[PDB]
Design a protein around this motif. Structure first.
Motif, short mmCIF file in Angstrom:
data_model
loop_
_atom_site.label_atom_id
_atom_site.label_comp_id
_atom_site.label_asym_id
_atom_site.label_seq_id
_atom_site.Cartn_x
_atom_site.Cartn_y
_atom_site.Cartn_z
N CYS A 1 7.06 -17.37 -55.19
CA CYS A 1 5.67 -17.67 -54.97
C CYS A 1 4.87 -16.40 -54.74
O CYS A 1 5.36 -15.46 -54.14
CB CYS A 1 5.53 -18.62 -53.79
N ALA B 1 22.16 -19.53 -51.77
CA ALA B 1 20.89 -18.84 -51.61
C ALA B 1 19.79 -19.75 -51.04
O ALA B 1 18.94 -19.28 -50.29
CB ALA B 1 20.43 -18.25 -52.93
N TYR B 2 19.83 -21.04 -51.38
CA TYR B 2 18.74 -22.00 -51.12
C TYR B 2 17.45 -21.54 -51.78
O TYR B 2 17.36 -20.41 -52.23
CB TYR B 2 18.53 -22.26 -49.62
N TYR B 3 16.46 -22.42 -51.85
CA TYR B 3 15.09 -22.03 -52.23
C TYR B 3 14.08 -22.96 -51.54
O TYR B 3 14.46 -23.93 -50.91
CB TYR B 3 14.90 -22.02 -53.75
N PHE C 1 27.33 -17.59 -53.39
CA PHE C 1 26.73 -17.78 -52.09
C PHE C 1 25.60 -18.77 -52.19
O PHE C 1 24.97 -18.89 -53.23
CB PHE C 1 26.26 -16.44 -51.49
N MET D 1 14.99 -15.93 -42.85
CA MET D 1 16.04 -15.60 -43.82
C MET D 1 17.27 -15.00 -43.15
O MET D 1 17.22 -14.59 -41.99
CB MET D 1 15.50 -14.65 -44.89
N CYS E 1 1.38 -21.41 -50.75
CA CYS E 1 2.71 -21.33 -51.28
C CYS E 1 3.76 -21.78 -50.30
O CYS E 1 3.69 -21.46 -49.13
CB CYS E 1 2.98 -19.90 -51.69
N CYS E 2 4.75 -22.52 -50.80
CA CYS E 2 5.93 -22.81 -50.02
C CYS E 2 6.94 -21.64 -50.15
O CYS E 2 7.58 -21.48 -51.18
CB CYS E 2 6.53 -24.16 -50.43
N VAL E 3 7.03 -20.84 -49.09
CA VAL E 3 7.80 -19.59 -49.09
C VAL E 3 8.81 -19.52 -47.96
O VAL E 3 8.62 -20.17 -46.94
CB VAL E 3 6.88 -18.33 -48.96
N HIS F 1 15.95 -12.15 -52.18
CA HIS F 1 15.96 -13.56 -52.57
C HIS F 1 15.11 -13.90 -53.80
O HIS F 1 15.55 -14.63 -54.67
CB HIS F 1 15.57 -14.45 -51.39
N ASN G 1 17.65 -10.56 -46.34
CA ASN G 1 16.80 -11.51 -47.05
C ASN G 1 17.43 -12.10 -48.29
O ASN G 1 16.84 -12.08 -49.37
CB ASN G 1 15.44 -10.88 -47.42
N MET G 2 18.64 -12.64 -48.13
CA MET G 2 19.38 -13.19 -49.24
C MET G 2 19.39 -14.70 -49.27
O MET G 2 19.38 -15.30 -50.34
CB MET G 2 20.82 -12.68 -49.21
N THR G 3 19.44 -15.33 -48.10
CA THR G 3 19.44 -16.80 -48.05
C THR G 3 18.27 -17.36 -47.20
O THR G 3 17.98 -16.84 -46.13
CB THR G 3 20.84 -17.44 -47.65
N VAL G 4 17.59 -18.38 -47.72
CA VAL G 4 16.49 -19.05 -47.00
C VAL G 4 17.05 -19.90 -45.87
O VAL G 4 17.92 -20.73 -46.10
CB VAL G 4 15.62 -19.94 -47.96
N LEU H 1 20.65 -24.38 -53.12
CA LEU H 1 20.94 -23.68 -54.36
C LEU H 1 22.12 -22.77 -54.10
O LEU H 1 22.09 -21.96 -53.18
CB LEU H 1 19.74 -22.85 -54.85
N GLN I 1 16.27 -15.55 -57.24
CA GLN I 1 15.60 -16.78 -57.70
C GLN I 1 15.02 -16.66 -59.11
O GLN I 1 15.13 -17.59 -59.92
CB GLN I 1 14.49 -17.18 -56.72
N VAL J 1 24.26 -19.81 -55.80
CA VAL J 1 24.16 -18.76 -56.80
C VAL J 1 25.56 -18.19 -57.08
O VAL J 1 26.26 -17.74 -56.18
CB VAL J 1 23.21 -17.64 -56.33
#
Lengths: 107, 108
Positions: B72, A31-33, A29, A77, A71-73, B52, A98-101, A10, B56, A12
């Motif tokens: 989540c 971000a991914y998710y 940037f 990061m 949850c997929c979390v 994040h 904690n901005m990008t996964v 992702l 999101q 952003v």
């Protein structure tokens, strides 16, 4: 989302998030998710907690209605360095955590 | 899909009901709890979103970019669970297991 819990691309764009007024650099940037199934029996690479393992079994083993999947979390990061204007128009350079996964886990 | 905000919910786990009664001696059950609920823009500060998750949730609120789920609702604080049990070799073991009980939930 049928596949297992993984990281997904992702990008952003700060103009599309409403923040182009205060943000100078960067314009965007990655971000991914995270998304995907956390289903019994979860592979060890999904790094479930003890709780998520038990929750996943309670879900699989029928009884007790309404128990969701773990949850997929974001697990790992990374930061983003942002150049921007203050509320007072001071130019500021800050590292936001904690901005990008980087990786995902079942929790 | 729980329509209330992200919060901790009651769940009692019975070890005989998850197939672990062969080896677990004590306790016979424990309150595991679980997390469920909405993490939608704008999230209250009490849901403790990460940077994040805040981002999101905004990307989701704006129609642009299909397929982006809500952050989540996951366990933030957890507690451990002392279990008396039988080894694969029939030794009696007492072990504190970490991350067994949800104490609080966050949007992540």
């Amino acid at each position: 989302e049928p596949r297992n819990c993984a990281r997904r691309y992702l990008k952003v764009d700060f103009a599309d998030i409403g923040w182009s007024e205060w943000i100078i650099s960067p314009k965007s940037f990655d971000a991914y998710y995270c998304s995907g199934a956390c289903q019994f029996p979860m592979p060890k690479s999904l790094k479930p907690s003890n709780h998520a393992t038990i929750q996943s079994i309670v879900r699989a083993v029928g009884v007790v209605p309404g128990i969701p999947e773990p949850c997929c979390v974001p697990e790992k990061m990374s930061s983003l360095s942002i150049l921007f204007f203050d509320e007072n128009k001071n130019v500021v350079l800050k590292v936001y955590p904690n901005m990008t996964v980087e990786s995902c886990a079942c929790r």
